[PDB]
Amino acid sequence: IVGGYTCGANTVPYQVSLNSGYHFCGGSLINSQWVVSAAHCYKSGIQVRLGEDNINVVEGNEQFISASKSIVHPSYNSNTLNNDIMLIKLKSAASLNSRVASISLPTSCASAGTQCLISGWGNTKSSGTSYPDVLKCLKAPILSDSSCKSAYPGQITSNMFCAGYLEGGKDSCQGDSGGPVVCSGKLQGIVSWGSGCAQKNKPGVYTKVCNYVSWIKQTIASN
Template identity: 70%
Template structure:
């Protein structure tokens, strides 16, 4: 059984998602990936416009420093930009226990300067089909049992599972706003510290790292917020803030 390390979030029944079984990303190959920091890295996020970041509601803190253009969290890098949050807006329907509507917007105090290392990722134009291979990234734990938090950004390519496979893995726990991505045989997954980070499929942000039982366990894939259901919420929230 997966044991929750001291830095892992625990809400309701769930232990939250590091990348297990992945590889070190090429430097600045994921230019939309951000680190949410409050004196330490605690979650990931995605830059969706020069002034807005999308993450998971369970990553909420009232004040957040957003670190952009990062590859190695332990080094000072020429590409990095550190920008404080001006507003942190959780979805009003977020449920702490079921993790339904696990989505949050962060407005940056000043717009990010876009560069080869800092880029926005498009929102989905439609929901992603089962079987599509996507890229998951983060600085989360790389061990399915034990802890090893990497300095360098980790990547994992994994398929979107069908709604039927997802519901069968977590009976009664999957809402229409969630999707499973990963491998039912286990061995590869997101894990603690990756929460809030991106799942990108065909160049669009389709998922947000949300929850799972343990990490990389057989029959228990990672569960992700289904971004395609929230495009209008994202657009209206940005427009009114």
């Protein structure tokens, strides 16, 4: 997260870190057994880390649970990043509490201008690199589809939205991938892609979760 703020420990209780020896992606807890992340975060050997603030220090509220199964969206295209969504099932149920909690799925799509919370352990610099240990946060609005399409000609599908600031300075970045965009208590986006980070006229692009709720529910119901 570039241009954000320190969230505060366990203030984003649905935020997960995906670990394969190291943090490599975020995700969102949507019930005691399932995480939603980006398909471009797929790999084998995932351990889900819940209850994290400092990802390099055991602070007392963590739950580390290995993934049993990952399900990349049937129609994910890694070239275009269309349908950039994946579900991860935990080998055992998390113990839900005030610091480890699910986030609700949307019941309808969000509109341009809606204020959302974007979070993660990604790079905090727009030029150069610095990786935080504690969770970072950014409040950002959803941008109109027309401004999104204008920013990225030929690249924005009906399964994507832009959020952030066209002036630049404030954005998600490498290592935030797969993490949440939450708006009024609903998971509306997943950190997906962009051109660099926090660049003028290049806002972050996010998977449009509301299009996937039926797939998520039916996948959970049979897995």
